[PDB]
Symmetry: D2
Subunit: 171 residues, 4 copies
């Protein structure tokens, strides 16, 4: 034989190991519209109707947003908007309520409960009405047979929703 | 009631969904030593003995490197170095061979096979010998009862090793 | 050379592949006690206080139940019971309500909301009062720094609770 | 109010929690054929050619076997058999060797190395030749763009192969 000494400069004692990391996908939507009927005297919602253009999804990452619109997700060609229709607002107190409504995603419809938390009624300095408020709730992808190709392992069956709203009087 | 129009500027139609992402952890070690005996006439390794200071792990992320040394991983206090001892080199041809040796990690020892691929023998311009070569192989964390607290789900049971070596003659 | 024909009887063309399966752990508790104060005239809970002996966990699998009591879970030696204390019952209607209370698990306490669904008030055939009802709600393991060693990947951060109750008048 | 005592007989203090379990899928194939040329004087394989009918997969579970043949896996209609063609057998010693060959799965072909371990040459009691032997090796699903729809998380990128063979002389 013959003996050698490492050249530490061009020698790697090296390893790869595969691990998982769980992480949240957060996204809003740039383009959506709503009808909001709300009686500040009794702090009750009367009519809440939301249409969201799927096209305008924003999960801060373009190559995913595009992918969201494909058959294995939204089908934005066939089903271009998702919609929410309030069917009932059960008041808890002036700050809180239980809003039941119809969610439709890719033409499939389920009744869901959202937690209304009134961020605060006011009559803005200009003399016209404003309100803050938020709607919170969990929906199951499985309930809307959504992204059915994707396993409940890779991506959560649970979607959490937070609709933050400022909103001003009409005409 | 009363009617409101969204203020799109301070309104988020928002969602969070939890998903997993598989990813490789790659790390070398800054401080290690080796005894390398190799006969270029027959391209056979004769003795290969490596000691790696666990302390010097580098997975390009300090807060993980530190964590690697704790009880649930390396135990670098109790077991400060991991070691490899060649017990056999079965030659395939001048470029390839099957190196069997003893790996010890945190005082637990298993015989492992590495795939020797000679990157190339030479007599460097200065008239002294050099060799390139690499050792490749998979080891199982479970085989060395390693990081036993961490599930084989979160972090792979499989560790892949690639030892890249340049090495020059002695004295 | 020489030619051979397989003996299909003692020949396996064989493969192993590792895959994940998500699955629910369902468990009750054999031993627990409660104080239940409820006014059938207004269908409001007045006081709801539950103590559950951790010891009596039953996830239909003994070797897991035992393991539940160890440091990396319940610590049943140090913290032998988990407890729920009602702090507020906000009535929705006669069938539904929002119960807020203090949950304590291994000595850590958080206020949680449960969804009360009255399964039905009655005056049983014997002339004494009975009530059915259920409490539903999600709690986060992370909120109670629970099983902190176990990753939110292996085991869900979310625990779902369903307390089904039949209950009869006192004395 | 009024006070109630639980009826422990019809009361569940109950919980669901979602967890993952990693597990091996093991399967053979019922129907396959091979050409085996092997020189017991030098214990070298000369020609090894295997064709496996995908149709005959057996992972001890019919509803999965069927599913294996669909577009998101084998495409057994379009690509009814997978095949292995030996291109080289590098002998280690009389018990061991490194077999390089072409694997084709759903019409995609990669060269793979299998570890030949001769279970034992003999001349059986009837005066004719027999041999035992096994071929072991890992292949990557990704290398054969296989089940590409299924994430490397749900199902391992790594497939392990063990071909166990008894085999008798021809004519
Ligand atoms: O990608 C690489 O070349 C590689 C790098 C390191 S540090 C360890 C193992 C490897 N493997 O397994 O190939
Ligand atoms: O972290 C938040 O405040 C949040 C943000 C968005 S965009 C959606 C849901 C949320 N939830 O569930 O809270
Ligand atoms: O456990 C076994 O012996 C084994 C069995 C089969 S069918 C395939 C691969 C294997 N490996 O990888 O060892
Ligand atoms: O499936 C059920 O009815 C259920 C059962 C138990 S023991 C706990 C929670 C549950 N949830 O969340 O519904």
């Amino acid at each position: 034989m013959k003996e050698y000494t490492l050249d530490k400069a061009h020698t790697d004692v090296c390893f790869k190991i595969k691990h998982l990391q769980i992480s949240n996908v957060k996204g809003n939507f740039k383009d959506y519209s709503a009808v909001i009927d709300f009686d500040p005297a009794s702090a009750e919602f009367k009519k809440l109707d939301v249409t969201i253009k799927i096209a305008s999804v924003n999960t801060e990452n373009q190559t995913r947003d595009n992918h969201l619109q494909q058959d294995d997700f939204f089908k934005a060609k066939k089903y271009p908007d998702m919609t929410f229709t309030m069917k009932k607002y059960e008041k808890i107190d002036n700050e809180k309520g239980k809003m039941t409504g119809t969610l439709t995603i890719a033409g499939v419809s389920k009744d869901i409960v959202l937690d209304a938390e009134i961020g605060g009624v006011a009559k803005g300095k200009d003399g016209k009405e404003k309100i803050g408020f938020s709607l919170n709730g969990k929906i199951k992808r499985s309930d809307f047979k959504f992204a059915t190709s994707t396993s409940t392992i890779t991506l959560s069956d649970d979607i959490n929703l937070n609709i933050e709203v400022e909103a001003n009087e009409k005409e």
